[PDB]
């Protein structure tokens, strides 16, 4: 196709990260509003950005959920790493959950630069490394001032389905946040 | 990282690595020579090498272990397999709107007759679009110029 | 390790240095920065380059940025090494002063090693003279090849 020095031919290759589904989670993107983190070939996690809210509570009962191991510890770990990676997290009233019956669901109210809405989108942008840029309109050239039009960021548990249309899955997203965990929080 | 990768039972030479048809998307299996993959243990600045250790660890963990879902295992070997700061570099490049590597596509120089290939470097992406061959042509030139020197030794 | 990538030579402007003019270093010198992991001067180049690069390519409202690239720029354990030397009252490097060997005629310089300090006083040239000797002896071998 294209030769260099007359003898060397330029060739390419594209890796299929879907193989790693058993050992590590894989993050991909469907459309502007929906993003996913697949942990296995059965269970998974859905990252959605919608103006429509699901949880009306203002309190997140974790201790009650921790007693009843109905949830999946794998999915509960990858959502635990997310919250710790959020920088400069101070107000907890914007965070609401609902772990009744094992169904894990967390909602972040983004209606409240250098705000709590940025930190959530900042961690979310790294988590869905595949196609996060489609979500933010002012992504390029903005770090602390990233913003959206959506009001809520909901994370729910879902079953595996072939919906990685916009971007192929990859673990690099989740891998990066493991080091960032518990490194930008204030004192309680 | 400290993971040592090696293809046991590999026919051609010891130390090389082959990517199966399942490891690649819409492509057949591809093998790489010892001279190329040897740089993976030496250098710390290659994204493709980090993927090989992930694919090898994923393969190694599957055949040698009993799955119960096995998330704790990776959460401990992360730093021993990939270069965490190499992920940070690409994120900084994306934040500054520099062409960055999303770890999917790679490019290498394959000899038409000899068959010796270079270590595939990552194909950078800008605005969800891979760079044209022209925009990093001089990167291929230094690779082709380095391909000669390595064979000379 | 670190991964920041800083043709290939580096020049320190008159603003980067204190009471000194701009100074440039050859490719062969700065090439050691990517190879070795235990050089303080190289960590400063990546800090000055990251600070320079971030300014022109970004719009300041910027503390969160550095808090994520610290490990990708400098060697954290290299800072710990100097702290241990200070705690044990060994001459340590406070990252301010460096010394290098400049060829009077050729102009080739070595990679500037840190000038150690003991009790707020920089060491005399005599107290680390043998360090300069091994550097000058190594400078020849590089010049030969």
């Amino acid at each position: 196709t294209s030769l260099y020095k007359g003898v060397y031919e330029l060739q390419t290759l594209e890796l299929n990260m879907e193989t790693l589904n058993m050992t590590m989670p894989l993050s991909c993107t469907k459309n502007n509003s929906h993003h996913y983190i697949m942990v296995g070939n059965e269970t998974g996690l859905e990252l959605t950005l919608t103006n429509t809210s699901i949880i009306n509570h203002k309190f997140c009962n974790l201790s009650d959920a921790h007693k009843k191991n109905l949830y999946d510890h794998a999915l509960m770990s990858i959502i635990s790493t997310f919250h710790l990676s959020i920088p400069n997290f101070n107000q907890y009233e914007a965070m609401s959950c609902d772990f009744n019956g094992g169904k894990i669901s967390v909602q972040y109210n983004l209606s409240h630069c250098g705000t709590v809405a940025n930190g959530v989108l900042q961690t979310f942008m790294r988590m869905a490394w595949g196609g996060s840029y489609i979500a933010l309109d002012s992504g390029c050239g903005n770090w602390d001032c990233i913003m959206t039009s959506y009001q809520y960021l909901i994370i729910q548990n879902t079953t595996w389905e072939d919906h990685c249309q916009f971007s192929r899955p990859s673990p690099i997203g989740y891998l990066g946040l493991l080091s960032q965990r518990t490194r930008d929080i204030y004192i309680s | 990282f400290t993971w040592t990768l090696s293809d046991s039972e590999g026919k051609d030479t010891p130390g090389g690595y082959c990517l199966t048809r399942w490891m690649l998307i819409e492509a057949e299996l591809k093998c790489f020579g010892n001279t190329a993959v040897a740089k993976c243990n030496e250098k710390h600045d290659e994204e493709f090498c980090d993927m090989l250790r992930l694919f090898d660890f994923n393969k190694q963990a599957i055949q040698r272990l009993k799955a119960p879902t096995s998330i704790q295992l990776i959460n401990k070997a992360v730093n021993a397999l990939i270069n965490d700061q190499l992920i940070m570099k690409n994120h900084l490049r994306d934040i500054m709107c520099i062409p960055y590597c999303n770890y999917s596509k790679y490019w290498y120089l394959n000899h038409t007759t000899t068959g010796r290939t270079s270590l595939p470097k990552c194909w950078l992406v800008s605005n969800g679009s891979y760079l044209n061959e022209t925009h990093f042509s001089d990167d291929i030139e230094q690779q082709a110029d380095n391909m000669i020197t390595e064979m000379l030794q | 390790t670190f991964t920041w990538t800083l043709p290939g030579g580096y020049c320190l402007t008159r603003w980067m240095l204190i009471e000194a003019e701009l100074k440039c270093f050859g490719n062969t010198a700065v090439a050691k920065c990517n190879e070795k992991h235990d050089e303080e001067f190289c960590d400063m180049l990546r800090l000055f380059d990251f600070n320079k690069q971030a300014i022109q390519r970004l719009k300041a409202p910027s503390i969160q940025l550095i808090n994520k690239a610290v490990n990708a720029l400098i060697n954290d354990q290299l800072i710990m090494k100097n702290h241990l030397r200070d705690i044990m009252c060994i001459p340590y490097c406070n990252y301010s002063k460096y010394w290098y060997l400049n060829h009077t005629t050729t102009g080739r310089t070595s990679l500037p090693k840190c000038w150690l300090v003991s009790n707020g006083s920089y060491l005399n040239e005599t107290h680390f003279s043998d360090d300069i000797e091994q550097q000058a002896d190594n400078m020849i071998t590089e010049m030969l090849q």
């Epitope: 294209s2 030769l3 260099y4 020095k5 007359g6 390029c140 | 709107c97 520099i98 062409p99 950078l124 800008s126 605005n127 679009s129 760079l131 044209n132 061959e133 022209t134 925009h135 990093f136 042509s137 001089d138 990167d139 291929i140 030139e141 230094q142 082709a144 110029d145 | 990538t5 043709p7 290939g8 022109q56 390519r57």
Partner: antibody, heavy 123, light 111 residues
């Protein structure tokens, strides 16, 4: 000082041929990629052709130029050449040779430009 | 025909701030962030005033600034001075060719 100098401009008949040169002064010629940008005396700049660094394996031409111009380089001789053929009257412009580096990691823009050589086409 | 559309001329009083717009297609200006601006004085060769949209080469006055929004780049010259009266061109990476240049704009310091 880092310099680039052109040579070979002059009067040529319509349909003839002309040969241009570009010499380096004060930098490593091989590492960089070189281009040819002509400027119509009364109009803006137009990119013509490009040559990759080291071995000139990657060559690019403009659609208004393709098939008629042929670029070449000699790293040892530090000379960049452009061969013109089937010259049209509209090719009359001031031709410059500029450098840059096409790297994904450390790219270089068209920083160094030559003084330019004037080429006139009229039979 | 010029690939990038540039205004005929932009003018301003000494000490003012004027901006030149470099409008392109989605395949060039919008695709990449390699947009360059050149200052050409009469008789001289184009001098690289800004590269990579907003990065400024060493030795260029801090009065020159670059911007971009979608398919349009903007070169802003604040604190106009008589020495700035020259012709300005813009260039960018392209999917079809390595470089695509603009028609050019003449900046006049209204005296």
């Amino acid at each position: 000082q880092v310099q680039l100098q052109e040579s070979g401009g002059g009067l040529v008949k319509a349909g003839g041929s002309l040969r241009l040169s570009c010499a380096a002064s004060g930098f490593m010629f091989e590492r960089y990629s070189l281009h040819w940008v002509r400027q119509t005396p009364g109009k803006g700049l137009e990119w013509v052709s490009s040559i990759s660094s080291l071995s000139g394996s990657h060559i690019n031409y403009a659609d208004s130029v393709k098939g008629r111009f042929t670029i070449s380089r000699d790293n040892a001789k530090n000379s960049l050449s452009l061969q013109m053929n089937s010259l049209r009257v509209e090719d009359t412009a001031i031709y410059y040779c500029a450098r840059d580096r096409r790297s994904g990691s450390s790219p270089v823009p068209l920083d160094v430009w030559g003084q330019g050589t004037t080429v006139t086409v009229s039979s | 025909l010029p690939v990038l559309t540039q205004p005929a001329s932009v003018s301003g009083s000494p000490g003012q701030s004027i901006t030149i717009s470099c409008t392109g297609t989605s395949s060039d200006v919008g695709a990449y962030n390699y947009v360059s601006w050149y200052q050409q004085h009469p008789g001289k060769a184009p001098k690289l005033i800004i590269y990579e949209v907003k990065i400024r080469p060493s030795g260029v006055s801090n009065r020159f600034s670059g911007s971009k929004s979608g398919n349009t780049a903007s070169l802003t010259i604040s604190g106009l001075q008589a020495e700035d009266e020259a012709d300005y061109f813009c260039s960018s990476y392209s999917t079809n060719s390595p470089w695509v240049f603009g028609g050019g704009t003449k900046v006049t310091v209204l005296r």
